[PDB]
Symmetry: C2
Subunit: 118 residues, 2 copies
């Protein structure tokens, strides 16, 4: 259905995330390449997108979404379904610390319902 | 408190509208200069801004808020309080027709609580 992690701009946010296909989970990562954790989080998300082609995976440089966003709120991951926020992970502690492995983020997104298999 | 109609970009939407000062009414006009009605609506909204300095009045070119936005949804006026949408006016018919005078926008914005003399 999907399968790959996608880069989007600020003005594509509403279309891709808030108005995403009905009943689809969207996982948007709000990021800055300047932050090592963001670089890492995207690594796992690229991989997780392929493993869960049913879930939508997008990412965006916060500067083109929300101006003057603070480093201490990064990384930011929001989980959406039907234009509603199902989960928020804001900052290092919530996104699961500076060391964060593939399977830990997988789990993180799982207990909240964002990704499933069959 | 405010007093003038102000131009914002897409990435200033979240800060200026969704996260606007608690209890403040925000009137955002999503527009394009190519559409006469929009030109006319900004005229009224500039004047109204000054008359109701308690209400926040902003305007923004949709192309930098939502990409691929359809002419037929213009003009778009959203009314916000505390990050929640109180009223939506989308397209010519709802923004009160091609002839639309200062006082009938005022009334329309007033009927739903956006502007006030106290
Ligand atoms: Na489900
Ligand atoms: Na009130």
């Amino acid at each position: 259905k999907f399968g790959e992690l996608r880069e989007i701009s600020g003005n594509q946010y509403v279309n891709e995330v808030t108005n995403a296909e009905e009943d689809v989970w969207v996982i948007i990562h709000l990021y800055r390449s300047s932050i090592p954790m963001c670089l890492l989080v995207n690594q796992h998300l690229s991989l997780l997108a392929r493993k869960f082609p049913e879930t939508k995976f997008v990412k965006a440089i916060v500067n083109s979404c929300i101006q003057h966003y603070h480093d201490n709120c990064l990384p930011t991951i929001f989980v959406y379904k039907n234009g509603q926020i199902e989960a928020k992970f804001i900052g290092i502690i919530e996104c699961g610390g500076i060391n964060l492995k593939l399977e830990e983020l997988e789990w993180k997104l799982a207990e909240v319902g964002a990704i499933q298999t069959d």
